[PDB]
Amino acid sequence: PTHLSVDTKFKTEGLCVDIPGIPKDMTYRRLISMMGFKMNYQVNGYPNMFITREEAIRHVRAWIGFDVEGCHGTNLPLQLGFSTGVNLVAVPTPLMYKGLPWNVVRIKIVQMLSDTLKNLSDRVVFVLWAHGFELTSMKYFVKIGPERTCCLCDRRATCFSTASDTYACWHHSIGFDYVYNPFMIDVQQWGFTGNLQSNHDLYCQVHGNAHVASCDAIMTRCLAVHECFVKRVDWTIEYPIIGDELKINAACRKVQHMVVKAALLADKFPVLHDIGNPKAIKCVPQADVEWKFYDAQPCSDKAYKIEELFYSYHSDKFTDGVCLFWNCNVDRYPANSIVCRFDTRVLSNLNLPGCDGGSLYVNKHAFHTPAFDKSAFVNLKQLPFFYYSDSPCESHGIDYVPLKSATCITRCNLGGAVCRHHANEYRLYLDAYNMMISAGFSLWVYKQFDTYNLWNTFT
Numbered sequence: 472p473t474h475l476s477v478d479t480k481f482k483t484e485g486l487c488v489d490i491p492g493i494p495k496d497m498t499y500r501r502l503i504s505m506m507g508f509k510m511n512y513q514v515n516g517y518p519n520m521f522i523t524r525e526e527a528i529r530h531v532r533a534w535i536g537f538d539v540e541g542c543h544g545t546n547l548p549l550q551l552g553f554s555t556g557v558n559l560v561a562v563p564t565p566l567m568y569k570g571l572p573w574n575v576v577r578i579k580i581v582q583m584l585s586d587t588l589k590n591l592s593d594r595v596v597f598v599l600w601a602h603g604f605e606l607t608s609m610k611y612f613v614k615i616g617p618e619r620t621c622c623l624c625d626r627r628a629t630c631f632s633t634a635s636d637t638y639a640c641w642h643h644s645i646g647f648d649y650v651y652n653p654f655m656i657d658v659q660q661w662g663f664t665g666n667l668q669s670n671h672d673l674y675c676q677v678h679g680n681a682h683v684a685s686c687d688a689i690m691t692r693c694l695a696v697h698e699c700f701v702k703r704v705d706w707t708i709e710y711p712i713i714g715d716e717l718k719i720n721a722a723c724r725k726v727q728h729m730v731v732k733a734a735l736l737a738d739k740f741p742v743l744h745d746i747g748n749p750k751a752i753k754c755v756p757q758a759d760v761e762w763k764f765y766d767a768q769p770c771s772d773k774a775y776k777i778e779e780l781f782y783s784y785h786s787d788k789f790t791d792g793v794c795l796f797w798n799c800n801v802d803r804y805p806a807n808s809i810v811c812r813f814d815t816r817v818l819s820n821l822n823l824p825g826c827d828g829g830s831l832y833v834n835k836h837a838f839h840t841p842a843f844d845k846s847a848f849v850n851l852k853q854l855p856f857f858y859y860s861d862s863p864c865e866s867h868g869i870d871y872v873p874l875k876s877a878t879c880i881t882r883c884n885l886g887g888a889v890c891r892h893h894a895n896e897y898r899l900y901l902d903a904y905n906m907m908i909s910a911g912f913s914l915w916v917y918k919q920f921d922t923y924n925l926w927n928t929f930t
């Protein structure tokens with residue numbers, strides 16, 4: 472059951488307004504033929520243009536919502552909309568382009584998909600709410616065949632050029648005019664009652680319906696993300712490394728240890744309440760503090776209400792000592808908190824647009840994160856950058872320029888001059904810090920936090 476069988480049935484009720492008289496009995500095999508494509512009994516890596524819900528989830532980075540609305544179809548101009556916000560008008564002679572023939576439209580399609588996807592995925596998955604015109608328009612910009620490799624590199628081919636008769640990946644397709652071996656999934660096959668807008672609107676208020684094709688394309692991808700990552704969650708699906716995943720995760724571990732260790736030294740809390748990851752390990756193993764864990768899986772729909780996490784009868788007194796919320800998204804943090812909250816607004820190669828203001832953060836696993844809300848942090852302040860170290864000033868073992876910084880909290884800086892070891896360690900920590908912030912993470916701390924209290928931990 473690796474791929475979707477072409478002999479699987481396709482429900483055609485959603486297609487009968489654009490395609491009147493369409494047979495109720497229909498397979499993927501007959502549908503692909505009707506779309507103007509011939510598979511020719513080919514056992515060459517592309518068994519079906521359509522993929523399963525499971526194959527779509529594994530390739531969520533390739534998702535591009537796609538919708539076609541008739542402006543007037545052979546004789547009528549078509550508005551092609553994409554979840555990138557692009558609308559192209561194809562004549563058969565929220566960006567909006569005037570009517571142009573297919574030979575030029577197809578060039579823009581390849582450019583747009585290559586620019587959006589080259590740093591996300593090795594393919595494209597057209598996410599549909601199929602009504603007919605999107606399927607019958609595919610023959611105008613899509614070519615299919617055996618699985619091929621790029622002419623300039625080892626990646627799989629996603630584009631084709633009729634000018635040079637060659638194939639390219641998303642990185643080497645400039646001047647290419649055809650989308651080659653794309654994938655697609657019709658969301659309507661999943662079993663829904665009512666139209667696209669009524670299902671999308673049940674879960675999302677951030678996307679509206681301006682009655683343009685890109686609005687429907689955006690709503691379609693959003694509904695698919697809601698079904699696959701919000702109501703249904705799967706943390707056993709691994710996703711390939713496409714960027715700074717390892718560095719970001721290593722930086723997050725360094726920053727957490729640094730910030731918690733300093734908070735414990737500066738304010739000497741007798742107890743720490745560690746809320747979140749059921750598999751968490753103490754991030755400051757040598758700390759004196761009474762470490763107490765509370766299990767909460769990552770919330771993928773709405774942020775946790777602090778009243779439900781803490782109340783309904785544990786030290787019971789979460790007001791004692793400090794609360795650590797490391798990527799545990801709550802509606803309103805208590806004043807005695809140390810917090811790391813992912814900022815969904817920072818779109819990235821890792822961070823894909825999500826449902827209802829939220830975002831799909833994909834780093835090893837897929838994590839749909841509720842929309843960032845500045846009001847969650849009203850009892851706290853932004854944590855300032857600082858580097859703290861109690862390790863001995865000793866080199867052991869890249870060159871040197873003397874470091875001068877008021878935020879290098881070390882015995883050597885207290886004593887007047889930062890040693891080479893702490894200067895190297897400071898610069899590496901600052902790099903890790905900037906990496907985490909730029910990846911989208913935001914750090915918040917209790918208002919009384921003051922690094923001035925760390926200088927006296929050198930006595």
Ligand SMILES: CC(=O)Nc1ccc2cn[nH]c2c1
Pocket residue numbers: 534535536554555556587692818819823824
């Ligand atoms: C920064 C940015 O625009 N990201 C992005 C990534 C993937 C898709 C799919 N549809 N719209 C998208 C947008």
Ligand SMILES: CC(=O)Nc1ccc2cn[nH]c2c1
Pocket residue numbers: 724725728752753754755756
């Ligand atoms: C150098 C150092 O002490 N680092 C550190 C950082 C995080 C964790 C978590 N568990 N043990 C840790 C140790």
Ligand SMILES: [Zn+2]
Pocket residue numbers: 621622623624625626639640641642643
């Ligand atoms: Zn290439």
Ligand SMILES: [Zn+2]
Pocket residue numbers: 671675676677678689690693694825826827
């Ligand atoms: Zn939406």
Ligand SMILES: [Zn+2]
Pocket residue numbers: 863864865881882883884889890891892893
């Ligand atoms: Zn030093």
